[PDB]
From a paper:
Lipases are enzymes that reversibly catalyze the hydrolysis and synthesis of a large variety of glycerol esters.
To rule out that the presence of glycerol in the Tth MAG lipase structure is due to the addition of glycerol in the cryo-protectant buffer, we determined an additional Tth MAG lipase structure without using glycerol in any sample preparation step and cryo-protection prior to X-ray data collection.
Residue numbers in the entry:
A (entry chain A), B (entry chain B): 1 to 259
The structure:
């Protein structure tokens, strides 16, 4: 089953999609999915929609919302900061916990790229009530990526206009100010439940090396990695996305439907 | 106001969004928006969403749905053909005409890229009940574009396995066969009401020359062209998308709110 949903808080409306399995009644595991920077709840080549459908077939529900300033949700992209998306995510978790079909002890988080950074942070903040975590090419070095640009052209453009054009999106100076103060690696450290990282070797947006840091610096033996050979950042082929979705579904089926 | 909407016909469910202006009540002009090949109802850098919001402010509502096989709607991409998207468009027009806030004589069509080809055809099929037409880089040469793509890129796999991977999407042989039988220029010819074409000069997906053909071969003096200098296919900058949205909003404001 697929139904559209909304959240309204602080005068902000988030719009999303909720998937519940047709077969099983009662309370079910739920996966919350976080899209990345300039992405949206559907994500690249619909990989999020696919994931939800692949999950409901194993009796796992899911919700996917567009962050404020993106896609179907209200707001201008210029109003968005990483911290504001964090607050959106805290409200989304609250919404999932309020649904009468949600099993409170079976809630997982999934995040792609910058959504992986968010998912990491949220996982830590609620480490005792988030059952499992999947990270897809998680952009934990996002602060560093924004910082390096200070000496390049986007830095000079930001210094002059207070915003930059990243391809039909207005990236505010407020985002640079906000993100410069955060260390995703440290803010994600301390999550003890099982973690799955899926990463491509040819990822030219978040290099594969980043995942090594996460394995070394953020988690212990509870974290494991699926390497998708030859894959680009968003797993943009049928075989690459099939591998990502199947490994992640099996991880959530093992980790959420056991407890 | 923005609300999620659905259509179900012949065992298929389409999912979309409906925008109505808050201040004006009664029947209002309505714009139907058609996304392009591998796109979705939000479209590139949220330009469709923005276009809907810009329309609300001038008292024009809108609907944007994902075609069957894309985005939030049902179905796999392999099930989609150009003709199935035409049938979806006919059902979406039907849906708009059933809404009690729709002024039946004030319905306009907008299409981007392959969706513009959709709009061009639908406008002709309903030439007496479609009040105005906007085409954004309309891909009337889509049969030729796909034919060139098979000959140079797809290859034997299409014959051996029946499909090709176009970037996380399974493009079926049926689409190639179906689209080869259609002439978008001929099927759109005969629409007499006002038409706006917006096109970028550096468009590398649908060459600017195509718009020249549409002005000469498809429409008469009822058609007008806004050229956006240096712009790419989806007008992917703040300046380019502002120009496209404002020109289209003022065109729909003049042509739907008159007569
Ligand atoms: C991976 C991030 C791509 C966009 C970065 C833009 C940097 C702006 C700095 C002023």
């Amino acid at each position: 089953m697929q139904k559209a949903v909304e959240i309204t808080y602080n005068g902000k409306t988030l719009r999303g999609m909720m998937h519940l399995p047709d077969d099983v009644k009662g309370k079910v595991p739920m996966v919350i999915m976080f899209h990345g920077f300039t992405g949206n709840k559907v994500e690249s080549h619909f990989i999020f929609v696919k994931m939800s459908r692949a999950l409901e077939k194993v009796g796992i529900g899911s919700v996917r919302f567009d962050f404020y300033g993106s896609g179907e949700s209200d707001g201008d992209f210029s109003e968005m900061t990483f911290s504001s998306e964090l607050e959106d995510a805290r409200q989304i978790l609250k919404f999932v916990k309020e649904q009468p079909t949600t099993d409170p002890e079976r809630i997982g988080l999934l995040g792609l790229s910058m959504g992986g950074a968010i998912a990491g942070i949220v996982a830590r903040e609620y480490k005792d009530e988030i059952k499992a975590l999947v990270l897809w090419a998680p952009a934990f070095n996002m602060p560093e990526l924004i910082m390096n640009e200070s000496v390049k052209q986007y830095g000079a453009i930001m210094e002059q206009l207070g915003f930059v054009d990243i391809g039909g999106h207005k990236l505010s100076k407020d985002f640079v100010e906000d993100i410069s103060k955060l260390n995703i690696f440290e803010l994600s450290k301390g999550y003890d439940k099982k973690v799955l990282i899926v990463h491509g070797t040819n990822d030219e947006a978040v290099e594969y090396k980043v995942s090594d840091r996460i394995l070394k610096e953020v988690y212990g033996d509870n974290a494991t990695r699926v390497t998708i050979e030859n894959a680009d950042h968003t797993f943009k082929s049928l075989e690459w996305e099939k591998k990502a979705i199947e490994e992640s579904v099996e991880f959530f089926k093992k980790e959420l439907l056991k407890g």
